[PDB]
Design a protein around this ligand. Structure first.
Ligand SMILES: c1csc(-c2ncc[nH]2)c1
Length: 149
């Protein structure tokens, strides 16, 4: 799989994160990210995808060692951590044919797993509009604990 790169953008209080909503297969809410181009450097892919999806330029704020990286079905996804972006920042995507909406969400209110259906004696998980974000929520909480207490 081609690796993906993007960002976890937080506000000044460290309470809230920035999610984007796409269309169709990407119909729920997720962190802004995308596939790396041939010969493009990881920090440059992250800034590019985040600028296309949100209109905000992170290049001056990336810290090369501050990220969370997960492998999901043998595809690597890395999101650079970008704290202290004011909640009154105007975000506007390039690509409104790809992005429906852009919003701030409370970190403590986001799920870090989906719910089962063991009320109904049925296997699997119930749908959740935060599917794409879920896998990063517990590692982000643990990384904020370590770096800021
Ligand atoms: C693939 C992309 S996100 C994802 C996931 N979210 C929650 C559990 N697995 C799998």
């Amino acid at each position: 799989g081609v690796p993906t790169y993007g960002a976890i953008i937080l506000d000044e209080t460290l309470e809230n994160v920035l999610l984007v909503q796409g269309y169709l297969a990407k119909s729920g809410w997720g962190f802004p990210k995308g596939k790396v181009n041939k010969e493009e450097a990881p920090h440059d892919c992250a800034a590019r995808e985040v600028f296309e999806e949100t209109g905000f330029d992170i290049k001056d704020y990336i810290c090369k060692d501050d990220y969370i990286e997960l492998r999901i079905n043998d595809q690597l996804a890395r999101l650079y951590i970008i704290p202290g972006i004011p909640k009154d920042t105007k975000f506007n995507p390039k690509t409104r044919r790809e992005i429906r909406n852009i919003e701030w969400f409370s970190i403590e209110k986001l799920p870090c797993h989906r719910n089962d259906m063991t009320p109904k004696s049925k296997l699997g998980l119930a749908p959740n509009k935060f599917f794409m974000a879920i896998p990063f929520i517990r590692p982000l909480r643990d990384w904020l604990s370590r770096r800021f207490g």
